[PDB]
Amino acid sequence: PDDKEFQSVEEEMQSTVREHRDGGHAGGIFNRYNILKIQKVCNKKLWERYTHRRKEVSEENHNHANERMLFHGSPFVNAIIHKGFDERHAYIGGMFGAGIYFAENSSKSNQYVYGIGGGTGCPVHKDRSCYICHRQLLFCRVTLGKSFLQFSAMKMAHSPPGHHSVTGRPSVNGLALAEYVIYRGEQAYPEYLITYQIMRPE
Numbered sequence: 001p002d003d004k005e006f007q008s009v010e011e012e013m014q015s016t017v018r019e020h021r022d023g024g025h026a027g028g029i030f031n032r033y034n035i036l037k038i039q040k041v042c043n044k045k046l047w048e049r050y051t052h053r054r055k056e057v058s059e060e061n062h063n064h065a066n067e068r069m070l071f072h073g074s075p076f077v078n079a080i081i082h083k084g085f086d087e088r089h090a091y092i093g094g095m096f097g098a099g100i101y102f103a104e105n106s107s108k109s110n111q112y113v114y115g116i117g118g119g120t121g122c123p124v125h126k127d128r129s130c131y132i133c134h135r136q137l138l139f140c141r142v143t144l145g146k147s148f149l150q151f152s153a154m155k156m157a158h159s160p161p162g163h164h165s166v167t168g169r170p171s172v173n174g175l176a177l178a179e180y181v182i183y184r185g186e187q188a189y190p191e192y193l194i195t196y197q198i199m200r201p202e
């Protein structure tokens, strides 16, 4: 029961890895991970904040929440599991402005685990491609509702009028991979905490 639910999470984590345009600069060089632990996050207060907002979005989107399971990489995963996602920590600088960003490709979210563009990498070795240090990603329940499809940079403070999120679609002069942006922290729930390492290619 728990093992099968977690095997599904491991499969999503492994199967969504892609080769990155930066040649591994931000997230490191790897084709797969060593998945160490998968924990289900049970935070009743966050779950109800999430389901309350999901119902509200569904009602504003033809009885459809447009919920997706997506990855989130951040140095602040421990604060997110306890306090939830918080749009007050998002700033206008991002490609789609002051939102909370998610990926359908685990390796894209892996580029953010140690900071923007991988920061200086792991705290112990200052290596963005560290194979030793254990990383953590979140696999989240995200309510997209009526998602505004965009290709080019659009610095938003909030969702576009009548919408509940932004979907960043791949394009020639733009994104290599998709990304999903919400502008309200209650529109995501950090369901699984994945502890892993990137693995050195064979």
Ligand SMILES: Nc1cccc2c1CC=NC2=O
Binding pocket: 071, 072, 073, 074, 094, 101, 102, 103, 108, 109, 110, 112, 179, 180
């Ligand atoms: N910019 C972007 C795009 C897609 C996923 C993420 C991010 C930022 C932080 N964390 C992420 O997981």
Ligand SMILES: [Zn+2]
Binding pocket: 122, 123, 124, 125, 126, 127, 130, 131, 132, 133
């Ligand atoms: Zn390290």
